[PDB]
Design a protein around this nucleic acid. Structure first.
Lengths: 150, 144, 129
RNA sequence: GGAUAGUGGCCUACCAUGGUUUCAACGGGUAACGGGGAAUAAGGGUUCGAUUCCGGAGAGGGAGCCUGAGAAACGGCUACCACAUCCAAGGAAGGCAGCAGGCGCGCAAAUUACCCAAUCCUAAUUCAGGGAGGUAGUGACAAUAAAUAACGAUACAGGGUCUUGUAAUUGGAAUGAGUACAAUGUAAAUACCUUAACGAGGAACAAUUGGAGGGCAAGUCUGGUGCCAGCAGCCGCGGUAAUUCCAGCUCCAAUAGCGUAUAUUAAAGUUGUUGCAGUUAAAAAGCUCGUAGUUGAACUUUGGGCCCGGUUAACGGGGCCUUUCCUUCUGGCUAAACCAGGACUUUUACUUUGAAAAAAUUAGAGUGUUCAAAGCAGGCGUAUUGCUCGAAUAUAUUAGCAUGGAAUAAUAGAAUAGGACGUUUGGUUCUAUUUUGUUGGUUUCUAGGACCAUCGUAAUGAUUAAUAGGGACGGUCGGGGGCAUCAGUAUUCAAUUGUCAGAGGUGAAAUUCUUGGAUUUAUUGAAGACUAACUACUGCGAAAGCAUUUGCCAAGGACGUUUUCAUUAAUCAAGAACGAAAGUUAGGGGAUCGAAGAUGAUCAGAUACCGUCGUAGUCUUAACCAUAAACUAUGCCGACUAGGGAUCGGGUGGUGUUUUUUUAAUGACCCACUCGGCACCUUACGAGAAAUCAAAGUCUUUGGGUUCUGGGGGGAGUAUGGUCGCAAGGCUGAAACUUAAAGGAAUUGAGGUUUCCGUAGGUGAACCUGCGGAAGGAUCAUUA
C-alpha cells in the first residue's frame, strides 16, 4: 500500500506487450531525439517531455522508439539537472508547506504532513547517495532547502 | 506470522526474547535469585535441627474432635522461628521443652499437606534418637 | 511485501487442491518455482502446467489431477547437512515409504531420495506428499 | 633507551589523541576453577560437572627474596596483620586445603592399623627410601549373582478312570549360613576358591518396608473408645466438622530391601527453533513517523547428438561436438595456434569428502570371569622342553586446515569509456643472468617492466518496467486542517408598553420574585456559547477527532494515464510529531450549565433521596500534563479461498430516460461493467471451549516477513531505585508471604438496584457529585 498512508489503490499505467515500433507510426527514429532536447532547453522536466510527446506527436513511449530513456538522452547531451526530478519536487513541496506553517503556527495537520514529507525526502536522498548520484553527504537541511529550490 | 523472527540470521533476538520471558517464570526466578539462600525457613537444605521453644495447641474444631497439637521451634543455624508437625497422638508427651528435634519437609513444596495451615515441617527425630521406633516400643529415649 | 513467491505459489496450489479446481493460476513465476513444480510433477502429484510469458515476470497455469495431499514451503531455507536430511523426513512426512522433501543442493533442486542417491546435500526448500 | 631468557607501554624521557561500545563496551552478581564428562533416551533440549584423567591457582592473609636448569617454593627463609606455644621473664620457636586423629560447624562423611610384595618415582644407585601407592579396618553411597526350602506316601474337595488344592498326618534323601584340622592365598596375615569333622523340623537357622474412598493393587472385615436434652430406660439402637479415634484378622506391591525430606529431569506443547497463547479466559503499545536489527520481486548455459562407462530393462560417472574448457609459466611436434607438464573463489556464505584430533566414559566385535556386573584376556598341543589368534570398530555436530560441487543468498565489473585486444608505430623511466680478463664508473645494441599518444579489431559497453514503491500530470471528491468572515433561533440580562394575584419547583413540601407589577404578552438592544431538523448501520482524518455561509492558505486519498526514475521497499529497540475530557501557570471574557460551597424541609417511603443561589471550571490566547471501556477489547505488510444486493468516490460503454426550446456538449436518473472504500444478509467448504468468525480460514497434514505483549489467584501497579512533570502525577517496576483454585462460553432448575473507565472535589466508607468516553445493556409499530 501507500508508503505513508492507509490507501491501497492500484491505479497505474499498463505498458503493451510490444518492444518495437507501432506499425502506424512510420515518422522517424532520430527526429524524436532533437524533439526531446529542444523541449528540454525550454525548461521541461522529462515527465512533461514524455506526456507532451505522447499527447501531441504520437510517441507511444520514448524508450521503445529511440532505444534510450529520457534521463539517458539528456545526460548524453549534457542537460542533466544537479538533482533528479522527484527529489526536487519533494523539496519544493516541503518548502511550500514550511512557508505555510510559518505563517500559520497552529496547523498541526500541516505539521504532521511536513514530518511525512521530510521523512520521504530523507529516504530518497539516502537512496541517491547510496548509488552516489549525489555527493556522498549532500545533507538536506531546513533553511538551505528554501535556498536550494530557487 | 506467529510474531517471532524466522530469519536465518535472527538468533540473537530469539535468544534474548527467550531470556526475558524465562525470567517471567516461577521456578527459574526462584532458582537464579538464590531464594533458598536468602529467605527460606531452612537454608534451602533438606533437613534441619532445632530446639523446642513451646507447644501450641491448634485444634480442628471444638474439643469433641481429634487432638492435633504441635510445637514451635527455632532453628539452630539460621535462628529462624518456625512451627512443625509432630505426628499423631501418643507422640505429644514424647517431645519436651528444649528437646533437640530434627525436622524435614511436609510434602507440597512449601504448601500445607492436609487441613493444618501454618505448618510446613514434620518431626523426624526427637532427643537425637528416633521418632518412629520410639513409638513402636523398639527403643527408649535416653535421659539428657 | 512479497517476501517469497514460492510460498505464495505453494499456498495457491494448496488452496486450489483443497477447494477442488482443476486449473490454478500462479503469479509471479520463477526458476525455483518451475523446478519445484517439475519435481512435484515427475512423481505425478500434479498434472501439466504452462508458463504464460508476459514481458514482466510471467505466470503459470497448472493443471491439477487430484492425488495431491499437501505441499508446503519451509522457511527459512535452513542449511541441511546430509546426516540430518532423514531427520527432516521424520519431522514432516506421513510415512517412511511415501512423501518427498525438497532440497536445493549444488546439483540442482531435487527430492531427498535423489539427494541421498547422489550423496549430496544443500539447503531445504519445501515438501510435498 | 633501560630491564628481561626474550617480544612487548614491561618501565622510562619526548611527541601526537587516541582506543572499546546497543553486533551490550563498562559497572555489578555468581551458594563460578575450566574441560573430558553425568543424569534425563523419539528428536530437539534441560539440569549438573567441589570429586579417580588433562590444564590452572593456592598453602591462615598482603608482601619480598636466597639457592638452583627449574620456585616468587611455604614438610625454604625475612619482615608486616591475625591467631598461638615454651619457660628460670633475659629470650626462643609455629603453619595437617599430605596420612592417620581431635575440636568447631552443621542434615551431612571412616583406622592416631601393616608393608614397600605389586605399580611407578628419586639418589652416587639392581641393594636404601617413598602415609606416592598397595593391604587390611569402618562403611546398606552406587552396582553384580541368588539363601530363607525341595521330593514322596495316606485321608478329603475336585477336574474325573489319571491330574490338581487342603491336612496341629507321616517318611526319609540334599544343602549352606555357620564352626574348623589342612592346603591354598598373602610381604605376613584376613577374606575368597578347595576340603577331613560338626552343623534343619518349625516359638527351625522365624524377612522386612509401606498401603487397603479415587489416582493406585488390595476390606459390602471385626471389636473397643470419647459425645447425644434423637427412641427405650440401666440390656441397648441410631447418629457424632470423632477430617475416623484406636486396636486385632485378612489382603495387596516390592523384596535383602522399603518408605520419607530436598533439589532436578521426564511425561509438560506451563518457556514453545522444532513447539504455545494475545476478541471474550493473562496479554496487540492511543496513534503515526523513524535509526540500529531482522526481511525483501523477476531475469544471465538451457536443450540436444556421440560414445565409452560402474551396480542391481532401471540408478549413478566422465569425456567430446553443438558460436561454448575461460586464466598464469619451463621444454618438444611444428608453421599469436598443439602436447608432456607447475597452480587458481572478484570476495564470501552453503554443502560433500579428507585430515589432525589424549586415555578413561558412551555405542559396539571377540572372549563361558561357574552366569553376570566386570576384565582384556586367552586358546590348542607330542601337556618332556612347544605353537598360536587377539587387545578391533563408530561418533564428536562450533573455530582453524585441505578438497569436489556451483543450485540457493549475496557482492564487484564498461557510462565523461579513464573499457578488453594488436608482430600499428615514436618518445619517456628503471634494471641488466650476459660478451668485450674481474671490479668501479661512460655508451650503444639487446632483454624485461611502467608511462605518454597516435592506427585499428568488435553485434563495441546501459535486463524487464513487479496488478512493488516513490514522482509528474488531468478532472474530481470529502462534516480533513489553519486564518478571516457570515448567519440562525435559543438562553440570560437591560429598556419601553400591557394587566392583575399569584409564579417557581417536586412524590408531597420549603427557600425564592411579586400590588416599586412577579409570571405572561408585545417592540428593541447587548453578551457569550452552540450549530437542532436535514443526519443515513453515509463521508473525511494516523489516532484523538470533524456538521451554518463565503474567501484565502497549504495538504490529501481513490481514479485515469502507451508519463518519469528502477528497488529507492516491509516491519521497526533509540529517538520524535499529534494525542478526548478532567487538571496546572499568566491575560481575556464570563450567556448557559455547574465540582466546591450557602441555605429549605427531612414526611415509616424517597421505592419518587430533591430545590434555589452558585466559585473553580466550561470558551480563548501563550505555555505545560500525556491518561480513558484512547474499543473493532481483534498489530502492520503480502497472497489465496464463497455466494447476494445495496451504497460512497472515480473511470468505460448504452441507434437508454430527462432538462435546453430543438432534443447538439453538458447536469440528473436508469442499465451493464471496472478500480478503491464504509458496511450489510445467508452458509460451513474451513476454525473454535462456545458465543461466534470471509477472518478469529488456508495450523498435530504444525514454517511468507516483522514489532510489541502473557505465563495459576491475591500481595500489587504496592515498596524501592531511576527518569520526566510547576503540581497532580506519567513511564520503569518487585519481593517476603498466602492460596487449590481463579476465570471464560453456553444450556438446564432496614434500605437503596445499571455496570464500569480516565480525571477533580467533598464525604462515617464501599459513597455523592462535575466533565468526557464505553456496553462487557433486552428493537416493538409504520414505511421502503
Amino acid at each position: 500500500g501507500r508508503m505513508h498512508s492507509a490507501g491501497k489503490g492500484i491505479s497505474s499505467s499498463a505498458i503493451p506487450y510490444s518492444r518495437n515500433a507501432p506499425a502506424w507510426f512510420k515518422l522517424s527514429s532520430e527526429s524524436v531525439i532533437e524533439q526531446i532536447v529542444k523541449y528540454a532547453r525550454k525548461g521541461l522536466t522529462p515527465s512533461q517531455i514524455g506526456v507532451l510527446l505522447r499527447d501531441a506527436h504520437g510517441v507511444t513511449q520514448a524508450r521503445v522508439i529511440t532505444g534510450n530513456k529520457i534521463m539517458r538522452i539528456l545526460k548524453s547531451n549534457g542537460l542533466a539537472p544537479e538533482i533528479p526530478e522527484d527529489l526536487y519536487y519533494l523539496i519544493k513541496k516541503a518548502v511550500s508547506v514550511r512557508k505555510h506553517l510559518e505563517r500559520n503556527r497552529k496547523d498541526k495537520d500541516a505539521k504532521f504532513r511536513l514530518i511525512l514529507i521530510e521523512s520521504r525526502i530523507h529516504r530518497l536522498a539516502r537512496y541517491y547517495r547510496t548509488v552516489a548520484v549525489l555527493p556522498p553527504n549532500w545533507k538536506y537541511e531546513s533553511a538551505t532547502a528554501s535556498a536550494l529550490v530557487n | 506470522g506467529k510474531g517471532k523472527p524466522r530469519g536465518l540470521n535472527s538468533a540473537r533476538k530469539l535468544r534474548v526474547h527467550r531470556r526475558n520471558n524465562r525470567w517471567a517464570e516461577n521456578n527459574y526466578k526462584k532458582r537464579l535469585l538464590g531464594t533458598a539462600f536468602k529467605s527460606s525457613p531452612f537454608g534451602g537444605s533438606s533437613h534441619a535441627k532445632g530446639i523446642v521453644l513451646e507447644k501450641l495447641g491448634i485444634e480442628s474444631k471444638q474439643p469433641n474432635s481429634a487432638i492435633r497439637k504441635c510445637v514451635r521451634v527455632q532453628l539452630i543455624k539460621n535462628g529462624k522461628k518456625v512451627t512443625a508437625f509432630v505426628p499423631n497422638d501418643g507422640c505429644l508427651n514424647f517431645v519436651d521443652e528444649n528437646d533437640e528435634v530434627l525436622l524435614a519437609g511436609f510434602g507440597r513444596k512449601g504448601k500445607a499437606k492436609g487441613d493444618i495451615p501454618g505448618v510446613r515441617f514434620k518431626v523426624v527425630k526427637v532427643s537425637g534418637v528416633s521418632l518412629l521406633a520410639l513409638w513402636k516400643e523398639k527403643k527408649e529415649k535416653p535421659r539428657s | 511485501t512479497r517476501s517469497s513467491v514460492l510460498a505464495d505459489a505453494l499456498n495457491a496450489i494448496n488452496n486450489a487442491e483443497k477447494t477442488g479446481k482443476r486449473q490454478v493460476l500462479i503469479r509471479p513465476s520463477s526458476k525455483v518455482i518451475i523446478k519445484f513444480l517439475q519435481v512435484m510433477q515427475k512423481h505425478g502429484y500434479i498434472g501439466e502446467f504452462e508458463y504464460i510469458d508476459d514481458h514482466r515476470s510471467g505466470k503459470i497455469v497448472v493443471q491439477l489431477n487430484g492425488r495431491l495431499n499437501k505441499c508446503g514451503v519451509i522457511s527459512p531455507r535452513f542449511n541441511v547437512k546430509i546426516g540430518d536430511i532423514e531427520k527432516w523426513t521424520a519431522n514432516l512426512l506421513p510415512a517412511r515409504q511415501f512423501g518427498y522433501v525438497i532440497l536445493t543442493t549444488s546439483a540442482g533442486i531435487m527430492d531427498h531420495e535423489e539427494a541421498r542417491r547422489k550423496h549430496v546435500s544443500g539447503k531445504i526448500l519445501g515438501f510435498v506428499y
